Ligand SMILES: CCCCCCCC/C=C/CCCCCCCC(=O)O[C@@H](COC(=O)CCCCCCCCCCCCCCC)COP(=O)([O-])OCC[N+](C)(C)C
Ligand SMILES: CCCCCCCC/C=C/CCCCCCCC(=O)O[C@@H](COC(=O)CCCCCCCCCCCCCCC)COP(=O)([O-])OCC[N+](C)(C)C
Ligand SMILES: CCCCCCCC/C=C/CCCCCCCC(=O)O[C@@H](COC(=O)CCCCCCCCCCCCCCC)COP(=O)([O-])OCC[N+](C)(C)C
Ligand SMILES: CCCCCCCC/C=C/CCCCCCCC(=O)O[C@@H](COC(=O)CCCCCCCCCCCCCCC)COP(=O)([O-])OCC[N+](C)(C)C
Ligand SMILES: CCCCCCCC/C=C/CCCCCCCC(=O)O[C@@H](COC(=O)CCCCCCCCCCCCCCC)COP(=O)([O-])OCC[N+](C)(C)C
Ligand SMILES: CCCCCCCC/C=C\CCCCCCCC(=O)O[C@@H](COC(=O)CCCCCCCCCCCCCCC)COP(=O)([O-])OCC[N+](C)(C)C
Ligand SMILES: CCCCCCCC/C=C\CCCCCCCC(=O)O[C@@H](COC(=O)CCCCCCCCCCCCCCC)COP(=O)([O-])OCC[N+](C)(C)C
């Protein structure tokens with residue numbers, strides 16, 4: 001059509017994930033490929049693209065379609081003359097044990113739109129991105145890319161970053177207090193280590209600034225409501241604005257460089273919770289922070305700032321001048337601070353006596369403590385009790401995705417890893433295509449068992465079991 | 480009585496060893512920021528320039544004995560209060576109310592398991 005969709009595209013567009021719709025979509029999706037080969041065996045139906053350039057496999061991954069995705073990856077057409085359209089190939093079976101070759105042609109970072117890329121980089125307006133990492137050839141592919149060449153690099157990124165915050169702490173702790181900020185450099189062994197510690201701290205601050213600025217502009221354009229999806233990357237960019245903010249103030253002869261550097265230190269150590277994802281039980285703790293600093297704390301700090309600025313306007317209107325730790329509490333800033341201390345647990349009734357009408361002054365403080373210390377802070381605990389029960393299940397789904405983006409970004413950063421990114425490549429011969437040729441398609445492997453049924457298998461690639469680097473193919477193959 | 484002491488050995492290795500890593504990031508995060516601010520004597524009296532004292536003065540906000548304006552030897556009062564108010568909201572309001580919710584989930588899990596562990600610890 002005008003959009004570029006063909007028949008196999010439109011069956012994906014008209015899916016809506018319900019188990020009745022998954023039945024007759026994949027049934028009708030099956031019948032067209034076979035009938036495509038009977039009329040046109042020279043045609044390859046699923047290579048075709050629309051004007052966005054997506055294949056019907058990747059279109060099911062770009063949207064949230066899970067049943068159409070689980071079908072195409074686990075696709076075997078058992079009947080002969082149209083078996084080359086399969087994707088899941090069982091290789092041998094020895095009673096219970098059932099070994100299968102999944103296929104990795106369009107997926108696994110080989111092409112322009114691989115479904116491992118398109119799932120992870122999707123803008124979260126498409127649902128069920130977390131669900132689409134549960135299918136079988138993907139969920140054992142990311143787990144088996146982590147166990148070699150990515151666990152070694154991710155532990156090295158976390159070690160260099162911890163050597164960055166020890167240098168940037170110590171170079172800021174021992175800063176000169178003497179005078180105006182472009183400081184001369186004495187010939188000591190102390191000042192050589194310090195000005196080295198500053199140059200290694202600015203150059204780290206440029207690195208987080210450039211990887212920020214390619215994430216927003218050169219790749220991945222992002223709208224304003226998407227900054228709760230890209231939360232973990234926004235914090236590494238705000239840090240690099242303060243650290244480069246100090247270098248402007250440092251050479252502008254301004255003493256306010258210690259007001260921007262310090263917010264980079266406090267945000268520097270705090271962003272070390274970015275690396276505690278990729279660990280399972282640690283990672284569910286830091287997911288709940290980014291889900292409850294935008295949901296439960298931003299709602300609570302609106303209601304709390306109504307009550308605090310409600311009653312601390314009432315109290316300053318009461319208390320008069322000196323009238324006769326001493327301080328004039330007539331400022332609105334002091335009395336908004338003295339009523340914050342009731343929440344913190346350091347709460348001083350009778351903090352002043354410069355008022356008049358003692359009866360209404362105590363009633364205001366006692367109506368404040370019951371509203372704020374007794375009621376809201378015991379409602380916040382109950383509402384976090386409901387939120388943690390909800391995102392107990394969701395956070396396992398978000399953690400697997402936050403493991404997957406690490407694996408993709410490491411592959412894009414190295415060309416020699418891309419020739420090592422062929423996880424279980426093996427370039428295996430699988431079957432026989434039309435025009436009488438070998439298959440030669442990159443294939444993965446898996447193992448299962450079955451005991452409820454008797455495990456009857458119609459087609460088996462290798463008649464003789466096991467994988468000992470020597471096989472003989474079965475005569476079950478037609479050609 | 481025995482179901483009470485099983486929950487201690489299951490939550491001094493699971494819930495407290497995870498919490499005391501995140502808490503020691505925030506406490507050593509902000510108490511590095513504060514010592515970099517506060518300058519020398521410049522003119523309960525004490526020199527708060529040590530990292531040990533200021534890591535202790537920010538522990539006291541968790542314990543419920545929390546003194547804002549614990550020093551005045553700094554400069555830039557506006558950034559000193561913002562650091563303390565971003566600390567108290569992060570630590571006293573957010574994490575300690577997340578710890579109560581996460582112990583609420585753990586006790587519901589090991590309510591059933593602890594009857595099973597008690598019979599073994601009797602055996
Ligand atoms: C007194 C105390 C003693 C301590 C002495 C300290 C002196 C040494 C200090 C050194 C730190 C100074 C460098 C600053 C740059 C920042 C580095 C960084 O953290 O970024 C990355 C490093 O991963 C990389 O790819 C960059 C590698 C850095 C160059 C290596 C040279 C130093 C090696 C050192 C070891 C030599 C071993 C030799 C070989 C075995 C990791 O971060 P990221 O996760 O990629 O960024 C977030 C990504 N995100 C934005 C998408 C979320
Ligand atoms: C593994 C975990 C632990 C690791 C431990 C790591 C090392 C541990 C320790 C390390 C150093 C121990 C200190 C010895 C020297 C003390 C100096 C002194 O007494 O004079 C004075 C400094 O006045 C100066 O300007 C002199 C500068 C010399 C200090 C050396 C800088 C540190 C190295 C650069 C970084 C390395 C870069 C590496 C590059 C490759 C004393 O300073 P102050 O009175 O405290 O001023 C505070 C100012 N404030 C309160 C206003 C904020
Ligand atoms: C110069 C100073 C540099 C220091 C930093 C250099 C560090 C370099 C790297 C260090 C990495 C440490 C080695 C990890 C190797 C095994 C991984 C693993 O078992 O995965 C499991 C962890 O699952 C969890 O949730 C347990 C958490 C343990 C990891 C420790 C957290 C970070 C502490 C670090 C402190 C940083 C200090 C902060 C900054 C000073 C996940 O598998 P599972 O499904 O859960 O299976 C359960 C099996 N189990 C029973 C074993 C749990
Ligand atoms: C002088 C005047 C001061 C006040 C004017 C400033 C207000 C100007 C405008 C502000 C607009 C919001 C800015 C706050 C950032 C929060 C992020 C966000 O909104 O995205 C969240 C959208 O989900 C929601 O918005 C609903 C849940 C939070 C309610 C937001 C109310 C905050 C307004 C008062 C804030 C004051 C706090 C501090 C006060 C200083 C996404 O996070 P989530 O967890 O995925 O959402 C739940 C799931 N859900 C999408 C299915 C629903
Ligand atoms: C300067 C650098 C400082 C940091 C470097 C030190 C880190 C070096 C390495 C440390 C490795 C661990 C040592 C802590 C002892 C805990 C016991 C344990 O791990 O066994 C537990 C394994 O289960 C788990 O590990 C997952 C749940 C806890 C996560 C552990 C993170 C602690 C790392 C930060 C600790 C810092 C705390 C204090 C900070 C001073 C068994 O208990 P469980 O309840 O049966 O497990 C849950 C059930 N499960 C098995 C099914 C999952
Ligand atoms: C959890 C965090 C809390 C912790 C503490 C936070 C504390 C921060 C809270 C507040 C900031 C404190 C500073 C304010 C200034 C008061 C000081 C003073 O002396 O008064 C002065 C100003 O006079 C007034 O300010 C009158 C008050 C008008 C209130 C208008 C409401 C604003 C709506 C807001 C919506 C919020 C609603 C909430 C909904 C989200 C009078 O003196 P002056 O003579 O005019 O001086 C001028 C000198 N000159 C003439 C030479 C130029
Ligand atoms: C809940 C429990 C908390 C309760 C309180 C706990 C408090 C404990 C917290 C901390 C211990 C307190 C003691 C430290 C020493 C500071 C004192 C001082 O005066 O500075 C001195 C050292 O200078 C420095 O120490 C600079 C700071 C280096 C920071 C390096 C980061 C370490 C990473 C850690 C990873 C952790 C991250 C967390 C992740 C798990 C400067 O003075 P000097 O001149 O050098 O003196 C030498 C004299 N001489 C020259 C003759 C020999």
Ligand SMILES: C=C(C)[C@]12C[C@@H](C)[C@@]34O[C@](Cc5ccccc5)(O[C@@H]1[C@@H]3C=C(COC(=O)Cc1ccc(O)c(OC)c1)C[C@]1(O)C(=O)C(C)=C[C@@H]41)O2
Nearest residue numbers: 232235238266267270271273274286289290293565568569
């Ligand atoms: C960019 C945002 C939205 C943000 C920037 C700063 C100012 C922040 O305050 C907030 C607002 C705020 C202020 C006070 C209390 C709660 C929230 O939340 C984060 C932001 C949030 C936190 C708390 O969250 C974290 O940093 C932990 C964290 C968890 C997961 C992550 O992936 C992560 O990034 C790696 C960081 C700590 C601060 O960054 C911090 O160090 C300081 C001084 C203030 C915190 O604004």
Ligand code: NA
Nearest residue numbers: 345346543544
């Ligand atoms: Na108290």
